Subunit: 312 residues, 2 copies
Amino acid sequence: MKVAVLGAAGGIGQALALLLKTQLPSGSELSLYDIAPVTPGVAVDLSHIPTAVKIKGFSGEDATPALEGADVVLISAGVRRKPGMDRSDLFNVNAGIVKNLVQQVAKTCPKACIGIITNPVNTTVAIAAEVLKKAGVYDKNKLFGVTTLDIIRSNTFVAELKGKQPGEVEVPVIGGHSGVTILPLLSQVPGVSFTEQEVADLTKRIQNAGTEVVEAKAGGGSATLSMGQAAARFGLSLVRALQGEQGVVECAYVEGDGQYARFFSQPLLLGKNGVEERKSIGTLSAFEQNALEGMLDTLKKDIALGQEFVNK
Amino acid sequence: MKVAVLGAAGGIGQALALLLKTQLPSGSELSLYDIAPVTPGVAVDLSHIPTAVKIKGFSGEDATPALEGADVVLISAGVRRKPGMDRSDLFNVNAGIVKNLVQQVAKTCPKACIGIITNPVNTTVAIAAEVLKKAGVYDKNKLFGVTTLDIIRSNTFVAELKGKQPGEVEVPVIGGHSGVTILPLLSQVPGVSFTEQEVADLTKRIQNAGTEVVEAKAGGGSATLSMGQAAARFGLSLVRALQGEQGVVECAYVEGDGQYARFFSQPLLLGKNGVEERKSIGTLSAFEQNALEGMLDTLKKDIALGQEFVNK
């Protein structure tokens, strides 16, 4: 398998690259790309770690060399927000970056599985889909908005609340990735029960977790190391499925049946061709039903902002 | 076990912290310290990863809170070199940093195992030893200069030369950590044989590997991600030994029998109290014997520079 990381010199890209270098299967290839001129030296740095994964780094305006033969492309380029901003406030600076990079993907490796990490994901995935459609190359089973950080945050917060082992709790999270559209399905967590006060408090903590890190870094950026971890988990799940492993399921933001919104994060069975099946969100508590109904107008405005950008 | 990382906000400290958060045994504690005000937010970032390792981050001039109850202290604070400099050119900026931090260690957790990563290690370990002696608290079995990056670099370069699996070759490296004092014992690598031209060429590549990364980053720093990996390996070896695991051996720069120089890196059996035994360097080829004899005057000048700093 070959995995390309676009945005490899940033805080997220370097943590991701380190985890992938040490965790990809033997025989894998990793290519790193950023316009930052340090990028080939980030690759030489990593190439000294004794694992059977070839790594090369590329710089400049042209990502083609990084993209040739890529099976998975992970896009983490983009600016972080500062204290007092929302994710959607990043649209002006990051929209053009995603458009440019996905055009290069569309020409060089149109059959690759593409994971978008760039903020605000609810909108940037819609930009990517429209770029791919305009190129005549869009496959809705191969475009993912990476929401895995919401999952592993939920796993941590639940285990600590409930005295469980963090490695042993998995919570489904649906919706999107913004303060209003992150919906953890606490009613579906096996072996644990919550009071209604616990549900309200946890859902708050989970929805505002990104802001809590931005506040705690005090102008020094947003979550990088935990986001590197979360993206490495998603990328490894992708690589396992593409290699033929059975029963790999992850929640991601994907174009689906449109029953809630055009793009929506839900549980997915992954296979050799991207998403194999979009699984049912199951039965919702009254709290969860209410939260889902309340987010829908905000989500489809997020989506419409991305489509507008590409199409007007 | 509690592990403190001093210098947690730099490139090395953040990679190290990520690997330790994900790899320390369940029940461990990790405390991060840097004067950089982003440091508590680096800890909040990592605290969202679902493993059973408590993490806290501290900022400011006082490292005491990070040091209370620490069993292992890993010191990675310090400036990197730029293209055209040598490691020893970092003495002016980094000597005072190491002195200050090791004074705080000497007051708060004098019984902790201390690993020094700060460049130039041949000299900064001598500074630390003299600070601890002046405090009345020095234990030569608990002070380590971390040389593990030379080991894993050698493992990578040999496996690729010889068509082996990188995970399956271990090469002993003795001496110190500088372009003249890194001596890989290629004659002692099990199952592989080298021509005399291969020995000369590999030993060169290994000795200049740090400069190759500094050149490749072009002013963007030195090795951070591979150094984070190497230090995480050493720290985990330390933690295993302290918990009672048998037969844990690592090469590190340590005060020993003085037969070559006061401090010298050689294979060490680790146990519950730091170093258990300093193992023999074994039999050297003619090349290796010659290289060892040629480095000795440079090494003891490195050591003398550190002692001078503390004692005059």
